[PDB]
């Protein structure tokens, strides 16, 4: 939906980041 | 001839009793599903680590470094009465053999002898000692699981490089195994006997059992260890300048300096050679902080500083970072 699309568009060794399920 | 050993070759890592627990150990064991050199001779064998031995007649083991009288050598002869373990600088033939009242081979330890069945022998050589593991279990290796109880310890001190076996002339065949250090997971029973062992470097279920400290696992996801990709070759590149740094000027001089008149020499834009320092004179203390005087051929940096002064012996320790 456009509201959650706008919400998504307004959000911006040896260490890894596990992706969510 | 080659023949895979299914699961045999498990011995007690220590004399510590345990009851129905799991103990993770890091010693030198025999890996599972490893080929062993089945011999059928009727020379000399290499010894990296382990003289894992099992035969289904033959008695005798040659141990030592160079097999001759130049260094200490070990001898084991087993007969029906006792066992004699003689260590000395003994001379040995290329192909020794026995006869049983004549010796054709050329401190002692007299104890009980080491006597279808299967005489499994596990030998170790670490910390200047010698360990013998043996249990005779009656029966392609047979399918089953059994341990190897320890025995007396022989303090030798020297290292072992090559070994050899003996032929008893009244033959038979024997397995020859090799050990490398890895991690086991031994499941002690309630009475205190080892009945099941699983490896830690195998198909990943065995590694999961290693890292979970359990024999039964359930469904789900388990993170055991890493998969860091591994390198295959080394790449080294230094500048193509060869000017032979003037270490001879600061070393080979008639008079260096006074204590209060320590001079200035600046050595740069060349490659160093630390292999010529040891040929000049024997060093007195030669202690080092920051760097070591062994790994100096692998470093490249800038702007060395060389100091020249002479001191009266007892103040050598005063030439150090932070001394009064």
């Amino acid at each position: 939906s456009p509201i959650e699309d706008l919400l998504f568009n307004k959000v911006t060794n040896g260490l890894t980041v596990l992706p969510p399920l | 001839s080659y023949t895979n050993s299914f699961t045999r070759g498990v011995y007690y890592p220590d004399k510590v009793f345990r009851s129905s627990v799991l103990h993770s150990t890091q010693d030198l064991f025999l890996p599972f599903f490893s080929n062993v050199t089945w011999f059928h001779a009727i020379p000399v064998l290499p010894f990296n680590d382990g003289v894992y031995f099992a035969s289904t007649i033959i008695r005798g083991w040659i141990f030592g470094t160079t097999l001759d009288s130049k260094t200490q050598s070990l001898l084991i002869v087993n007969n029906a009465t006792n066992v004699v373990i003689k260590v000395c600088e003994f001379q040995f033939c290329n192909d020794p053999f026995l006869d049983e009242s004549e010796f054709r081979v050329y401190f002692e330890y007299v104890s009980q002898p080491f006597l279808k069945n299967l005489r499994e022998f596990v030998f170790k050589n670490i910390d200047g000692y010698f360990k013998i593991y043996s249990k005779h279990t009656p029966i392609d290796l047979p399918q089953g699981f059994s341990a190897l109880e320890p025995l007396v310890d022989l303090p030798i001190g020297i290292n072992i490089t090559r070994f050899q076996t003996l032929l008893a002339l009244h033959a038979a065949a024997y397995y020859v195994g090799y050990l490398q250090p890895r991690t086991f997971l031994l499941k002690y029973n309630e009475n205190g006997t080892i009945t099941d062992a699983v490896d830690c470097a195998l198909d990943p279920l065995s590694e999961t059992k290693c890292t979970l400290k359990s024999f039964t696992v359930e469904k789900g996801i388990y993170q055991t260890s890493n998969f860091r990709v591994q390198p295959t070759e080394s790449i080294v590149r230094f500048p193509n300048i060869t000017n032979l740094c003037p270490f001879d000027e600061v070393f080979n001089a008639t008079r260096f300096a006074s204590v209060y008149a320590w001079n200035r020499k600046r050595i740069s834009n060349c490659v160093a050679d630390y292999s010529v320092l040891y040929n000049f004179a024997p060093f007195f203390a030669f202690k080092c902080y920051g760097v070591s005087p062994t790994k100096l051929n692998d470093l490249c940096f800038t702007n060395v500083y060389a100091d020249s002064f002479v001191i009266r012996g007892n103040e050598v320790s005063q030439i150090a970072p932070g001394q009064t």
Partner: protein
């Protein structure tokens, strides 16, 4: 950014420490490096738990 912390040692790069200094003194160099980065990791884990 805690990887570049010297922690009172001689050098921050552990490869340089292993390729420069004798294991009699590299033992205590690695000792102080491990305990410094270990307490740093403990602080990070505590912050993540909170």
């Amino acid at each position: 950014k805690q990887l570049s912390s010297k922690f009172g040692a001689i050098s921050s790069v552990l490869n340089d420490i292993l390729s420069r200094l004798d294991p009699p003194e590299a033992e205590v160099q690695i000792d102080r490096l491990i305990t410094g980065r270990l307490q740093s990791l403990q602080t990070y884990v505590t912050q993540q738990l909170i």
